Design a protein around this ligand. Structure first.
Ligand code: GNP
Length: 460
């Protein structure tokens, strides 16, 4: 019968049960990169506004040096189930995976794994102790009271609590505005040749048979032949679905993971004007001109930044994260002021192709794998992306950020005219280090990028 695919993701620390829990699910129904499986339960009544539900279990690596795999693979998922070793506490990458889930998941389900690894007598009041504690950490977040089930996939190296798990799952899972509205975009999980195949997940818009599909790292753009999904050929598919796509002949090595868009939808940004909200759990400073690891899409590149804030006189300005208004002014600042809204401008090393208005996560991933504190610095919408390559001249001169810089009678290069104050209640103006004075006896605003045609010092 007819079906719906929905991507539940399994995220957690290393050796928390993810792969071991994804099996337990798929059956009663390591890990160096995203791995997909799928169980089915009869489709809930509520979901017919689109009979079987098919949960696709996106399995994620735990290894801290593979965070970028997660960040990408959390955009593929609707509901994220955070699996936590119950014996060990809430570990490091776990409390990172919670951040990622906040940034990119709509709903959450905490799982307490390794139940058996506990004193059968005290078995409960520990769960109820780990449960009560989990409530507390989640309190601060948008997943205020997400479910917290205890299970055990491998009672050693039959699994408990798993049938209970799926019914809690087949209830919290929630499909968004499943619009095959906008420009089509697909994350490709596996791509191989037989034609050439692309088992990927759709993110935006629809795609009918024989449509026009661009592959950017492939340098050309083939047309869709067949579309096998639920073991049976389809004539059209849209968001949320996991799909299979046969396109013109080509080779795979030209991609292994990445993006498949509409004919022209995607950018090729060299830099971008981005909404930047800082992540609280990140201890430390976000420093204007500091090269962070930056994840934009199923792609993650190196970028130095520069932060700023709305006018001083217009801080308390609503927070708009849909477009940028290049009319207003913005005071250039040295670090993320910790300004209802604060922006920044990332200038990459290599370029980064991205769907317009995609989320961005700045992070410092040169750190140890056994790191001490969260490594995810800031997230934030990509408010605008400079497509131009020589953009610093071509387009930035359209932004108005400046650095409030500060430093015989009636007459004590490019400052020859600016009214300067002196300490005794006087005016004064530069001239020929001579200074003509009104009557008888600097606070300029250099635009950050105006020199290109103005090198201004014009202050009022
Ligand atoms: N005691 C106990 N051990 C379990 C249970 N479930 C899984 N394990 C143990 O967890 C160990 C590592 O977990 P595993 O699922 O392999 O790793 P993972 O969840 O995929 N994370 P990663 O991707 O880094 O391997 C396994 O060797 C398995 O024996 C459980 O329910 N109880």
């Amino acid at each position: 019968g007819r079906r719906v695919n929905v991507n539940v993701g399994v995220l957690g620390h290393i050796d928390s049960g993810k792969t071991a829990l994804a099996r337990a699910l798929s059956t009663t129904a390591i890990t160096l990169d995203l791995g997909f499986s799928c169980f089915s339960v009869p489709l809930p009544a509520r979901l017919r506004s689109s009979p079987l539900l098919q949960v696709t279990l996106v399995d994620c690596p735990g290894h801290a040096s593979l965070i970028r795999t997660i960040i990408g693979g959390a955009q593929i998922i609707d509901l994220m189930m955070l699996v936590i070793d119950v014996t060990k506490g809430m570990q490091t990458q776990s409390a990172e995976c919670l951040v990622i889930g906040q940034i990119a998941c709509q709903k959450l389900v905490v799982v307490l794994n390794k139940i058996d690894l506990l004193p059968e007598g005290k078995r409960q009041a520990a769960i109820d102790k780990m449960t009560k504690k989990m409530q507390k950490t989640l309190e601060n977040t948008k997943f205020r009271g997400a479910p917290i089930i205890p299970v055990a996939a491998k009672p050693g190296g039959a699994p408990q609590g798993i049938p209970e798990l799926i019914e809690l799952l087949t209830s919290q899972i929630s499909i968004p505005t499943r619009d095959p509205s906008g420009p089509f975009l697909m994350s490709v999980d596996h791509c191989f040749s037989i034609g050439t195949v692309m088992t990927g997940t759709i993110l935006s818009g629809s795609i009918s048979l024989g449509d026009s599909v661009e592959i950017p790292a492939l340098k050309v753009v083939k047309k869709v032949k067949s579309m096998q999904m639920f073991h049976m050929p389809i004539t059209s598919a849209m968001q949320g679905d996991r799909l299979g796509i046969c396109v013109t002949q080509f080779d795979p090595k030209l991609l292994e993971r990445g993006l498949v868009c509409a004919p022209e939808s995607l950018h090729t940004v060299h830099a971008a004007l981005i909404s930047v909200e800082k992540i609280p759990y990140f201890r430390g400073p976000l420093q204007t001109k500091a090269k962070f690891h930056i994840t934009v899409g199923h792609e993650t590149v190196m970028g130095r930044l520069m932060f700023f804030s709305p006018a001083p006189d217009n801080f308390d300005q609503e927070p708009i994260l849909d477009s940028f208004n290049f009319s207003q002014e913005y005071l250039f600042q040295e670090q993320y002021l910790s300004p209802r809204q604060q922006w920044a401008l990332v200038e990459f090393e290599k370029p980064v192709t991205c769907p317009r208005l995609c989320l961005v996560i700045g992070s410092r991933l040169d750190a140890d794998i056994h790191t001490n504190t969260c490594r995810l610095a800031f997230h934030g919408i990509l408010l605008h992306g400079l497509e131009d390559r020589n953009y610093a001249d071509s387009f930035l001169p359209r932004l108005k950020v400046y650095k409030l810089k500060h430093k015989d009678d009636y007459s004590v290069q490019l400052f020859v005219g600016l009214k300067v104050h002196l300490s005794t209640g006087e005016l004064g103006i530069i001239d020929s280090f001579k200074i003509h004075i009104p009557g008888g006896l600097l606070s300029l605003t250099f635009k950050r990028y105006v020199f290109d045609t103005h090198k201004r010092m014009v202050q009022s």
